[PDB]
Amino acid sequence: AATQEEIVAGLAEIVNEIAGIPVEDVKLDKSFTDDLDVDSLSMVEVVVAAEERFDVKIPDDDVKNLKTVGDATKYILDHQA
């Protein structure tokens, strides 16, 4: 279980590990594979550590359709426990 504050703010922690993007820069209007740029191939590893964080369940086949954390937020909320 998590909140938007865990998703948005929390992702930046994970994103800072995976790639090294600022711990507040992974905002709702910040697209992972566009504005953020998070290694690009390793992006699934962000998912893994995010799944670790929110306890979310998002397989590679599922995550392949995301964009920003705006999408990720309501998405992760429905895909988490």
Structural account:
This protein is an all-alpha fold and 81 residues long. It is built from five helices and no strands. It has helices at 4-18, 32-36, 43-54, 60-63, 69-79. It is globular and about 25 Å long. The PDB classes it as transport protein. Keywords: acyl carrier protein, intermediate binding, fatty acid synthase, Fatty acid biosynthesis, Lipid synthesis, Phosphopantetheine, transport protein.
Which descriptors would you attach to this protein?
ACP, mainly alpha, Non-ribosomal Peptide Synthetase Peptidyl Carrier Protein, Chain A, 81 residues, Acyl carrier protein
Brief summary of the model shown:
It is classed as transport protein. Keywords: acyl carrier protein, intermediate binding, fatty acid synthase, Fatty acid biosynthesis, Lipid synthesis, Phosphopantetheine, transport protein. With 81 residues, the chain is an all-alpha fold.
